[PDB]
Amino acid sequence: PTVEYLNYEVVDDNGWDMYDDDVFGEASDMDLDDEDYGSLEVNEGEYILEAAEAQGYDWPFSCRAGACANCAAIVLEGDIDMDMQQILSDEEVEDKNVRLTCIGSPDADEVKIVYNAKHLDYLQNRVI
Amino acid sequence: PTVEYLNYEVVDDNGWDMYDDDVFGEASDMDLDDEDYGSLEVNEGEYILEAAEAQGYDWPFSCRAGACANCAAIVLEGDIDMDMQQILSDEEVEDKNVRLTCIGSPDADEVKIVYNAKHLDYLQNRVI
Amino acid sequence: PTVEYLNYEVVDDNGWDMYDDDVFGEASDMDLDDEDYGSLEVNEGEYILEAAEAQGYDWPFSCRAGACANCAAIVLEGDIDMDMQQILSDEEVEDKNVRLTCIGSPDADEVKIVYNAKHLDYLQNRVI
Amino acid sequence: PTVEYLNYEVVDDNGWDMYDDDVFGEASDMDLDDEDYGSLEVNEGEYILEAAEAQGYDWPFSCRAGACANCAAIVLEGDIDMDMQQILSDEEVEDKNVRLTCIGSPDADEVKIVYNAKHLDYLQNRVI
Amino acid sequence: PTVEYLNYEVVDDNGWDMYDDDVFGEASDMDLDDEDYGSLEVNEGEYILEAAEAQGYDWPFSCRAGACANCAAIVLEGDIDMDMQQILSDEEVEDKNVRLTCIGSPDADEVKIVYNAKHLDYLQNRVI
Amino acid sequence: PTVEYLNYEVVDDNGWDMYDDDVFGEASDMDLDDEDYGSLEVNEGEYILEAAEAQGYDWPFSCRAGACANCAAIVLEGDIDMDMQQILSDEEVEDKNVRLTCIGSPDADEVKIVYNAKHLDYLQNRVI
Numbered sequence: 001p002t003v004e005y006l007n008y009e010v011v012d013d014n015g016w017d018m019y020d021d022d023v024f025g026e027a028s029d030m031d032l033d034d035e036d037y038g039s040l041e042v043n044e045g046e047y048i049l050e051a052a053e054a055q056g057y058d059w060p061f062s063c064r065a066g067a068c069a070n071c072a073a074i075v076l077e078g079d080i081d082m083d084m085q086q087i088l089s090d091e092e093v094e095d096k097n098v099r100l101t102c103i104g105s106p107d108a109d110e111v112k113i114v115y116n117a118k119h120l121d122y123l124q125n126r127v128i
Numbered sequence: 129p130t131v132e133y134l135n136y137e138v139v140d141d142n143g144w145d146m147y148d149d150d151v152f153g154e155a156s157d158m159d160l161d162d163e164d165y166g167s168l169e170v171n172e173g174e175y176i177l178e179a180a181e182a183q184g185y186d187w188p189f190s191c192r193a194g195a196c197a198n199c200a201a202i203v204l205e206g207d208i209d210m211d212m213q214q215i216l217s218d219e220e221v222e223d224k225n226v227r228l229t230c231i232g233s234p235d236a237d238e239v240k241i242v243y244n245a246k247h248l249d250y251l252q253n254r255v256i
Numbered sequence: 257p258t259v260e261y262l263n264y265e266v267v268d269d270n271g272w273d274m275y276d277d278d279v280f281g282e283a284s285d286m287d288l289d290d291e292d293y294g295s296l297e298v299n300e301g302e303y304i305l306e307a308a309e310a311q312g313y314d315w316p317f318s319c320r321a322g323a324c325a326n327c328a329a330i331v332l333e334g335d336i337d338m339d340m341q342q343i344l345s346d347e348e349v350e351d352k353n354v355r356l357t358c359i360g361s362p363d364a365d366e367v368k369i370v371y372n373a374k375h376l377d378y379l380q381n382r383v384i
Numbered sequence: 385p386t387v388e389y390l391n392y393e394v395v396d397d398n399g400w401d402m403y404d405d406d407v408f409g410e411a412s413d414m415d416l417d418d419e420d421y422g423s424l425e426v427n428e429g430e431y432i433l434e435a436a437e438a439q440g441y442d443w444p445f446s447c448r449a450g451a452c453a454n455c456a457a458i459v460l461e462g463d464i465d466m467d468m469q470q471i472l473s474d475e476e477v478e479d480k481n482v483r484l485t486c487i488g489s490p491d492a493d494e495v496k497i498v499y500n501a502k503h504l505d506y507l508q509n510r511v512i
Numbered sequence: 513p514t515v516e517y518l519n520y521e522v523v524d525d526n527g528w529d530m531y532d533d534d535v536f537g538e539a540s541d542m543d544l545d546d547e548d549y550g551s552l553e554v555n556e557g558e559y560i561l562e563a564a565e566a567q568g569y570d571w572p573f574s575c576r577a578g579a580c581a582n583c584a585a586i587v588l589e590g591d592i593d594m595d596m597q598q599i600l601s602d603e604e605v606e607d608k609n610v611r612l613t614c615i616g617s618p619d620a621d622e623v624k625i626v627y628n629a630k631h632l633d634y635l636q637n638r639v640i
Numbered sequence: 641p642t643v644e645y646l647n648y649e650v651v652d653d654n655g656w657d658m659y660d661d662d663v664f665g666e667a668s669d670m671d672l673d674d675e676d677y678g679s680l681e682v683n684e685g686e687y688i689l690e691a692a693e694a695q696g697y698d699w700p701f702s703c704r705a706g707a708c709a710n711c712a713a714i715v716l717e718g719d720i721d722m723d724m725q726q727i728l729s730d731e732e733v734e735d736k737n738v739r740l741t742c743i744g745s746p747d748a749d750e751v752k753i754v755y756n757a758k759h760l761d762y763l764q765n766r767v768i
């Protein structure tokens with residue numbers, strides 16, 4: 001699969017809303033470092049965080065076990081299949097689109113995420 | 129959580145349909161062995177197959193890795209959270225309600241399943 | 257289970273001895289942050305460190321594999337069941353009550369620990 | 385470590401009691417197959433079942449996850465360190481000396497077990 | 513990757529030698545069941561046994577942990593990357609081309625194996 | 641096994657070449673801290689990084705999953721058997737002798753490594 005990704009700090013510095021602004025289009029016209037914006041090839045069954053790390057991208061994580069929110073990302077297009085986790089609520093998964101990249105792989109041919117979503121205020125209570 | 133379970137072979141011997149017949153009510157009036165019908169306490173985060181095995185229930189499995197259909201169950205009420213798996217399609221998960229018990233835990237306080245769902249014909253192609 | 261916990265740095269700043277002082281009673285009259293003193297609900301089979309992290313508590317760890325002492329805690333009441341580990345001696349487990357929280361779950365309904373026990377001098381040689 | 389082992393079916397066929405009879409001495413004068421009596425070299429940290437399997441010994445197991453009793457053994461001398469497990473009670477571990485070989489390694493230089501202890505009647509309720 | 517595979521029992525029934533006979537060409541002119549001869553798509557990082565099982569192929573395995581020889585295959589073209597294992601010798605890996613399919617993934621775009629190689633006499637001592 | 645190890649920063653500060661200089665002999669005449677030069681006993685099947693950490697050596701790592709280069713070491717004598725990994729090329733493994741210590745164990749009775757090899761320029765692109 002292809003996961004296009006945008007570091008949440010770029011969304012936050014610009015005052016963008018990940019559903020009203022053309023976050024991926026506008027970050028492609030900037031000159032962000034590759035770990036902050038780009039597209040990543042990720043096999044089905046391959047963890048997104050580990051595909052990012054194998055490109056040398058030091059995306060956030062702490063536990064690597066679905067027991068924190070440090071690796072959270074928001075999926076804007078496509079889907080990410082996760083291992084079992086009890087930290088995110090059903091509403092955070094189904095409506096807020098929070099996925100944990102340490103334990104999630106692409107579930108669609110094309111996925112688009114805003115990673116580093118640990119800075120979202122509702123997730124700050126599970127960030128270690 | 130409590131997972132009430134019914135072995136699919138009882139549904140199949142009786143010609144029941146798991147959505148039109150009172151499968152759990154009618155199996156409670158029979159005298160099935162406890163591994164074939166009952167309710168199981170399963171912790172959040174605890175695999176349903178392993179909670180069944182720790183009661184001495186030898187529910188079906190082969191791979192234990194989300195790479196076959198031998199541990200499939202159909203969830204009729206509540207939900208089961210699974211580890212990442214590529215063997216079941218989105219339609220099998222979202223519409224047919226197939227969950228793999230070797231890698232799935234209860235995702236709700238009350239869950240009801242028809243286990244041993246590996247005998248369903250559409251899953252016979254992934255049964256090893 | 258319920259694990260009541262006290263960060264070892266509070267015991268050490270106060271010159272308390274974890275077996276002569278009323279360490280939990282006295283920390284309950286202070287105004288410590290919740291990660292430093294409180295009670296945690298932890299399922300049987302659930303790692304104590306991961307239950308702490310899912311509350312947003314950034315308790316110490318490095319390896320997460322029972323190969324260091326950074327996640328050590330001293331269990332004062334109840335018990336913690338650990339995965340296999342060769343780093344702690346029998347005397348450290350049976351007499352000094354050292355448990356590794358990254359690989360240990362509650363083994364009793366009520367457990368009381370002094371976590372962050374990596375600062376104990378006899379464990380400083382295995383702290384990374 | 386060295387784990388000397390005796391298949392429980394030899395103890396049971398002979399009417400021996402694993403604490404009054406010279407079970408290892410008497411099985412050494414028989415002509416059992418090597419998987420039924422012998423001594424096994426097992427590294428610290430190496431699972432006893434997997435050291436037996438790498439000698440081609442097909443010792444019993446089902447789940448390999450500490451969720452059944454099929455791999456049980458009784459440790460008569462030395463000790464076996466296990467991963468976390470909730471299936472055995474404290475009394476079964478501390479007084480009856482039940483260890484699960486799929487998730488246990490030697491915890492002493494010399495260990496002696498009676499494997500295939502799944503045939504003990506008090507464990508028959510967790511045998512799958 | 514593509515792994516073309518041939519069940520070793522076909523090689524053995526025909527008196528073929530996996531290095532002098534056109535084992536894959538000749539099995540393609542037979543009418544073997546798909547689990548006995550075919551080509552399998554296997555992701556890098558995906559275990560060959562689990563890719564076979566997800567096609568419903570019940571290829572041999574016992575331990576799934578690199579502690580037996582039941583899942584052995586001989587790689588004739590390309591390579592399979594394995595997890596750490598101590599059961600096979602260097603000569604069995606480098607010269608006899610034995611790979612354990614439960615813990616090995618394709619290491620080349622095109623791989624060709626003769627699976628079910630547990631029937632080879634030199635591996636019979638580690639078959640459980 | 642015995643793994644003799646030398647921190648790559650000592651090789652780099654001295655302008656040594658790990659194949660022309662007597663890197664281990666010359667570091668033995670210095671007064672490096674034990675984590676920077678010494679010999680480590682590591683069981684077959686035991687990860688080298690975890691054997692180092694259990695001596696209190698805080699050797700580099702990030703992912704612990706074979707998805708980065710932070711734990712790289714160069715093996716100068718003997719060999720290290722690794723779990724499956726897709727981050728290193730065949731040439732990096734076979735010719736440059738790069739091994740990932742988080743997922744590698746000794747594959748020979750005597751092994752000699754230059755750890756902390758993440759500072760090598762060709763590996764800097766996979767260092768997180």
Ligand code: FES
Nearest residue numbers: 062064066071102
């Ligand atoms: S790093 Fe904690 S859940 Fe992903």
Ligand code: FES
Nearest residue numbers: 190192194199230
């Ligand atoms: S036993 Fe194969 S997926 Fe559960």
Ligand code: FES
Nearest residue numbers: 318320322327358
């Ligand atoms: S963090 Fe190292 S043993 Fe727990």
Ligand code: FES
Nearest residue numbers: 446448450455486
């Ligand atoms: S085989 Fe089930 S606990 Fe060991």
Ligand code: FES
Nearest residue numbers: 574576578583614
């Ligand atoms: S099934 Fe035992 S090593 Fe693969």
Ligand code: FES
Nearest residue numbers: 702704706711742
């Ligand atoms: S720490 Fe990343 S591969 Fe070893």
Ligand SMILES: [K+]
Nearest residue numbers: 001002109110
């Ligand atoms: K694509």
Ligand SMILES: [K+]
Nearest residue numbers: 012013014015
């Ligand atoms: K802002």
Ligand SMILES: [K+]
Nearest residue numbers: 028030031032
């Ligand atoms: K750009």
Ligand SMILES: [K+]
Nearest residue numbers: 071072115116
């Ligand atoms: K993220």
Ligand SMILES: [K+]
Nearest residue numbers: 085086209235
């Ligand atoms: K969940």
Ligand SMILES: [K+]
Nearest residue numbers: 094095096097
């Ligand atoms: K949504």
Ligand SMILES: [K+]
Nearest residue numbers: 129130237238
């Ligand atoms: K309930």
Ligand SMILES: [K+]
Nearest residue numbers: 140141142143
């Ligand atoms: K029928």
Ligand SMILES: [K+]
Nearest residue numbers: 156158159160
């Ligand atoms: K009944």
Ligand SMILES: [K+]
Nearest residue numbers: 199200243244
């Ligand atoms: K089932």
